[PDB]
Design a protein around this ligand. Structure first.
Ligand SMILES: NS(=O)(=O)c1nc2ccccc2s1
Ligand SMILES: NS(=O)(=O)c1nc2ccccc2s1
Ligand SMILES: [Zn+2]
Length: 259
């Protein structure tokens, strides 16, 4: 079974041995070189439509924590921007570091942020998530950088439940959470074709990375770092540095929605 992780012996540099697409042509994340990225006037404004979102549950999956949504109908969707059609929000999760100087997956002119939020959506034309990941336009992931400064009020409900899902396989009710409280003011973005950043690393994602980071407090991110990779009663391994480094851009163009 799957035994990949972010440890000293099963981290990103090992993944290719069980997931050979790790060395593929459209892997994520990437470094965003802001001077090479081209303004594309043909891109549209994003439409983030989360007014009817229905969060359900939060889970420690042994790699991160994920907040899951009801994706059995169009409730919270992403449209527009580089996308054709409608993409349903299935879950969000974060990647973060052991200290504030690393944690993001994407980088901007080689700068690493303290963490990165991924809101994961799937293209409804394929009917279910499992079919969507097998298609080059199957997923859209909205990525948002976190820097450490002032607290993010809309994140606090998430941090306050983490004590209850400390170890792998623990979950808790997480209804009535509004993900709009995790967004920055501006929806200016970069976009490029890429992949899932954890195994199976499938090349099925249209990445939309917001230019404006959100600010979270040191206290908030410190609570992320108290989670465990391990299961209950097992030797404690703090859940930190659960990010994949930047991968080769190869023959891909990063486009900007803004001038
Ligand atoms: N990262 S992986 O190729 O999927 C993997 N690494 C390791 C290391 C030790 C035991 C099993 C596995 S499975
Ligand atoms: N980190 S991510 O590219 O947003 C992502 N990776 C995976 C892997 C398996 C299932 C869902 C997702 S969402
Ligand atoms: Zn992710």
């Amino acid at each position: 079974a799957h035994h990949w992780g972010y440890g000293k012996h099963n981290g990103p540099e090992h993944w290719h041995k069980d997931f050979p697409i790790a060395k593929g042509e459209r892997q994520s994340p990437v470094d965003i070189d802001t001077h090479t990225a081209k303004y594309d006037p043909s891109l549209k404004p994003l439409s983030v439509s989360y007014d009817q979102a229905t969060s359900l549950r939060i889970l420690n999956n042994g790699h991160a924590f994920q907040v899951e949504f009801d994706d059995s109908q169009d409730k919270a969707v992403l449209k527009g921007g580089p996308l054709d059609g409608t993409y349903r929000l299935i879950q969000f999760h974060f990647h973060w570091g052991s200290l504030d100087g690393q944690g993001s997956e994407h980088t901007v002119d080689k700068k690493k942020y303290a963490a990165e939020l991924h809101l994961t959506h799937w293209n409804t034309k394929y009917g279910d998530f499992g079919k969507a990941v097998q298609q080059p336009d199957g997923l859209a992931v909205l990525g948002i950088f976190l820097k450490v400064g002032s607290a993010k009020p809309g994140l606090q409900k998430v941090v306050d439940v983490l004590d209850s899902i400390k170890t792998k396989g623990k979950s808790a009710d997480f209804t009535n959470f509004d993900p709009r409280g995790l967004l920055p003011e501006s929806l200016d973005y970069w976009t490029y074709p890429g992949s899932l950043t954890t195994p199976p690393l499938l090349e099925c994602v249209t990445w939309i990375v917001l230019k404006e980071p959100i600010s979270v407090s040191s206290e908030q991110v410190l609570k992320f770092r108290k989670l465990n990779f391990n299961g209950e009663g097992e030797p404690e391994e703090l859940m930190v540095d659960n990010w994949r480094p930047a991968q080769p851009l190869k023959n891909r163009q990063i486009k900007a929605s803004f001038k």
